[PDB]
Amino acid sequence: MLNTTFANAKFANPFMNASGVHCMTIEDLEELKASQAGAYITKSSTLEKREGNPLPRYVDLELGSINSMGLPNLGFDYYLDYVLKNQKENAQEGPIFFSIAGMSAAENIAMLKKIQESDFSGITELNLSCPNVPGEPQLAYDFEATEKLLKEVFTFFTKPLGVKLPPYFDLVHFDIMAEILNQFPLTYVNSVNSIGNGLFIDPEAESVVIKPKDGFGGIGGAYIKPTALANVRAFYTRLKPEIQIIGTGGIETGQDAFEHLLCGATMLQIGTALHKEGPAIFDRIIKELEEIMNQKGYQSIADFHGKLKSL
Amino acid sequence: MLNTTFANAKFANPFMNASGVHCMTIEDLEELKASQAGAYITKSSTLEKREGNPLPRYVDLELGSINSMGLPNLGFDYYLDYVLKNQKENAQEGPIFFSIAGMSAAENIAMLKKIQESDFSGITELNLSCPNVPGEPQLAYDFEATEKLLKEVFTFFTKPLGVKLPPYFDLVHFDIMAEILNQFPLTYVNSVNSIGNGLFIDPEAESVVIKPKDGFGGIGGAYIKPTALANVRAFYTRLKPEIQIIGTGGIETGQDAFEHLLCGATMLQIGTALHKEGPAIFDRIIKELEEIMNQKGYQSIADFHGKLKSL
Numbered sequence: 233m234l235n236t237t238f239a240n241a242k243f244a245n246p247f248m249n250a251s252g253v254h255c256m257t258i259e260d261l262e263e264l265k266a267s268q269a270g271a272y273i274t275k276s277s278t279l280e281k282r283e284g285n286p287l288p289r290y291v292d293l294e295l296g297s298i299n300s301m302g303l304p305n306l307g308f309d310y311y312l313d314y315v316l317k318n319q320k321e322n323a324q325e326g327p328i329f330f331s332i333a334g335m336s337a338a339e340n341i342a343m344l345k346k347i348q349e350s351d352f353s354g355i356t357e358l359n360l361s362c363p364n365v366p367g368e369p370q371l372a373y374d375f376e377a378t379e380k381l382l383k384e385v386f387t388f389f390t391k392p393l394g395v396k397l398p399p400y401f402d403l404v405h406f407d408i409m410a411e412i413l414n415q416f417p418l419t420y421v422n423s424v425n426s427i428g429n430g431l432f433i434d435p436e437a438e439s440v441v442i443k444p445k446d447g448f449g450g451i452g453g454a455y456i457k458p459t460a461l462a463n464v465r466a467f468y469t470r471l472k473p474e475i476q477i478i479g480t481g482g483i484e485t486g487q488d489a490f491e492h493l494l495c496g497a498t499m500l501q502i503g504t505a506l507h508k509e510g511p512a513i514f515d516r517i518i519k520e521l522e523e524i525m526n527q528k529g530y531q532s533i534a535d536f537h538g539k540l541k542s543l
Numbered sequence: 544m545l546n547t548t549f550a551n552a553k554f555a556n557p558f559m560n561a562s563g564v565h566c567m568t569i570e571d572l573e574e575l576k577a578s579q580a581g582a583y584i585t586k587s588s589t590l591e592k593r594e595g596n597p598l599p600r601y602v603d604l605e606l607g608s609i610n611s612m613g614l615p616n617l618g619f620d621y622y623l624d625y626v627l628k629n630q631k632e633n634a635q636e637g638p639i640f641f642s643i644a645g646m647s648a649a650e651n652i653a654m655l656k657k658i659q660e661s662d663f664s665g666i667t668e669l670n671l672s673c674p675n676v677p678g679e680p681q682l683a684y685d686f687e688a689t690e691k692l693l694k695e696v697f698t699f700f701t702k703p704l705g706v707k708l709p710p711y712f713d714l715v716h717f718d719i720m721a722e723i724l725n726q727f728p729l730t731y732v733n734s735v736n737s738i739g740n741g742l743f744i745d746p747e748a749e750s751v752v753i754k755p756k757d758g759f760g761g762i763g764g765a766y767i768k769p770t771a772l773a774n775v776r777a778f779y780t781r782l783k784p785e786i787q788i789i790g791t792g793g794i795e796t797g798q799d800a801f802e803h804l805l806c807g808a809t810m811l812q813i814g815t816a817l818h819k820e821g822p823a824i825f826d827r828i829i830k831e832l833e834e835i836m837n838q839k840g841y842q843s844i845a846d847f848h849g850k851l852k853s854l
């Protein structure tokens with residue numbers, strides 16, 4: 233029922249982990265491979281290995297989560313070596329996704345070239361929106377810098393590429409970004425990364441709950457579904473059909489997944505909910521979505537994909 | 544216990560309605576006056592009377608609300624005539640707040656001049672962030688246009704003035720805006736207006752819940768407290784002490800109020816929660832806040848105002 237075609241590849245279902253969650257080590261990745269997830273993506277990596285920000289840096293919240301991980305990762309070469317060797321065993325339906333989040337344009341270009349030169353036949357995701365690195369704003373909020381980077385990227389990168397975008401809240405920003413993105417042979421757009429620099433407070437102790445950046449961190453979960461759905465839908469009605477979409481944000485139940493698909497998303501990523509529940513979430517949500525489809529008499533995602541009705 | 548000094552005026556408590564909620568007519572305003580609210584503000588007005596967007600345009604949600612009112616209001620002259628006549632009876636402790644949201648820079652300048660020329664001795668709030676007007680982006684997201692407007696405003700407006708800002712999600716944006724605002728003799732900054740262009744979906748009917756803008760509307764309530772608290776706090780540590788702050792967003796309990804004050808807010812505005820509960824909310828939340836203060840042994844807001852601790 234959930235069979236999906238994305239980036240010219242076949243997946244058993246649209247579900248994936250969101251980058252940053254349950255994908256730090258080879259062990260995490262193999263666990264995602266063994267789960268019911270239709271596909272998975274690696275932790276955004278940087279050229280060098282990173283310890284990340286001081287703890288506590290992640291906190292579960294009643295309505296979601298707040299975090300300022302600081303991009304902890306085992307380094308580009310670690311992830312590249314992994315996907316390459318994995319690619320050779322052909323032990324899974326659908327390619328693996330490789331996320332990169334360079335500390336600079338030079339680092340991103342350098343990593344993209346290594347991927348281009350390697351035999352990697354999977355999908356690449358360029359993270360233009362990490363909101364938890366001190367003294368480093370979000371690239372995707374600088375429309376000019378974003379376009380400049382993408383133009384250079386496409387003078388050499390020919391492999392499948394998607395971009396992880398932060399949320400937008402003004403319709404003109406969607407128009408500007410869509411116009412920028414439509415000029416490239418992009419494979420997809422992933423909306424959205426966590427809502428940037430939010431704040432949670434323990435009223436009793438009268439203090440923040442995470443140590444870095446004075447408690448400011450990216451917000452995920454139920455808090456952001458309205459924003460995530462809007463971004464997926466807004467880009468769905470503005471991006472040329474060649475550029476598909478991955479919906480990310482506030483997905484916890486089959487109903488949340490249904491809403492994202494209804495907006496126009498093809499693949500779906502789970503962050504906060506996966507972090508709290510573990511890989512078993514995929515089996516649960518898959519069944520929840522199929523039950524919704526069965527009640528409505530739908531046998532394939534194409535029966536409602538992108539069909540959100542206006543009043 | 545909640546006595547507050549703001550814009551050189553005395554208020555019995557920091558609570559107010561948020562512009563747009565329970566302040567459309569003279570009758571709504573008198574009801575706010577009769578309530579326990581420490582102060583109140585009028586519905587953002589335009590030079591001409593406006594019917595607003597087609598219904599349904601506002602919907603209560605489990606975690607908040609979504610709306611695209613379209614600035615319905617009875618016109619500038621209506622509100623001005625009201626505050627002027629009320630001013631003469633001196634029937635309340637603390638001045639009234641007058642919100643304006645011109646459809647253009649010219650309309651805003653025109654309204655500010657009328658206020659400047661009139662005998663209005665109250666406080667004025669310039670709304671630079673209405674996210675529900677079709678074909679009209681948010682001014683406060685255009686740093687250049689915002690500064691240009693404010694420079695012209697201050698060549699003639701000498702009365703108390705505050706600005707209603709949309710939420711920011713990047714630390715550099717806070718730096719840019721603070722630098723812009725600090726150059727003016729601004730009375731205050733009100734963070735934040737609703738989270739712009741979010742989307743809510745009825746999964747059963749497979750459609751949006753509000754008619755205008757294909758269902759996209761401003762998000763309010765619990766959904767946005769993390770963002771609202773961050774904006775209040777971020778500006779609190781960047782604005783010169785002459786510019787005070789009004790905290791708005793996700794305030795429903797005395798605890799939410801406590802958090803905003805802890806971040807640096809002096810006055811507090813309630814939107815969504817007031818819309819659902821009615822003016823009686825003020826009596827409730829006031830008692831909830833005093834109970835929190837009593838448990839902690841605080842006798843005045845100054846005992847914890849702005850004292851949010853970092854880890």
Ligand SMILES: Cc1cc2nc3c(=O)[nH]c(=O)nc-3n(C[C@H](O)[C@H](O)[C@H](O)COP(=O)(O)O)c2cc1C
Binds near residue numbers: 481501503
């Ligand atoms: C602990 C944690 C780490 C994350 N790290 C990354 C990351 O490395 N790269 C990335 O693109 N997004 C990262 N994100 C954001 C997610 O990919 C996702 O966009 C966000 O959490 C919104 O989805 P959710 O509502 O399901 O949590 C991270 C989120 C969390 C909670």
Ligand SMILES: Cc1cc2nc3c(=O)[nH]c(=O)nc-3n(C[C@H](O)[C@H](O)[C@H](O)COP(=O)(O)O)c2cc1C
Binds near residue numbers: 563644763764
């Ligand atoms: C029905 C409705 C109408 C609103 N109209 C205005 C308005 O005219 N001017 C303004 O500055 N904000 C307006 N807002 C936004 C609020 O003032 C407030 O910033 C927002 O709702 C965030 O607060 P909350 O979480 O308490 O709802 C409106 C909000 C709602 C729900």
Ligand SMILES: O=C(O)c1cc(=O)[nH]c(=O)[nH]1
Binds near residue numbers: 299304361365450
């Ligand atoms: O690793 C992180 O801190 C991080 C990166 C990113 O892109 N998003 C997020 O929420 N956290």
Ligand SMILES: O=C(O)c1cc(=O)[nH]c(=O)[nH]1
Binds near residue numbers: 563672674
């Ligand atoms: O009247 C409206 O539509 C409106 C204005 C504004 O500034 N904010 C909001 O949420 N609605």
Ligand SMILES: [Mg+2]
Binds near residue numbers: 264265266267
């Ligand atoms: Mg598997």
Ligand SMILES: [Mg+2]
Binds near residue numbers: 575576578580
């Ligand atoms: Mg009263």
